Design a protein around this ligand. Sequence first.
Ligand SMILES: O=Cc1cc(O)ccc1Br
Length: 175
Amino acid sequence: PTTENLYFQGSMNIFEMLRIDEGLRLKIYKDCEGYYTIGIGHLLTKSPDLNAAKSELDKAIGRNCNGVITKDEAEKLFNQDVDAAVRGILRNAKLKPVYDSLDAVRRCAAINHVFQMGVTGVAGFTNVLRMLQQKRWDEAAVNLAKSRWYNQCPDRAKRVITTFRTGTWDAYKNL
Ligand SMILES: O=Cc1cc(O)ccc1Br
């Protein structure tokens, strides 16, 4: 690796990782599962009603947005969603011990997964959680690849699954 590539490690963190997986959109749009979304993967509501989604948006941002936000507002909402995912792992008696056993880069993949799926969805993956705590990385990844989370929307999940396999940032390189 060049001095370049050894530096890529310090450029990557959970915010840059989720930013690649979720993208950045300043107007309400439907994600791959058809849920209204905005910003960096902020799911507004699972209602098919755009009006509900606009309502959730104005609550979340605190102004009359009419479906559109700024980059700064997107980043603020993103930071809030990241903190919620972390806090949801740390208070959960099933997820915390597994998270504590992980290295720094797989801990980012765990926060990413909870950001995407929510706590109860992730904590339900009993086999994946035990494989990870036992450092059975290849099996954990194969089992994540069976999930509906990955299969209904592979492009948003694939790099998280690669990161659980390898504990490196390689899947985020060379976009
Ligand atoms: O915390 C979330 C999480 C998510 C996973 O897919 C595996 C392990 C953990 Br600890």
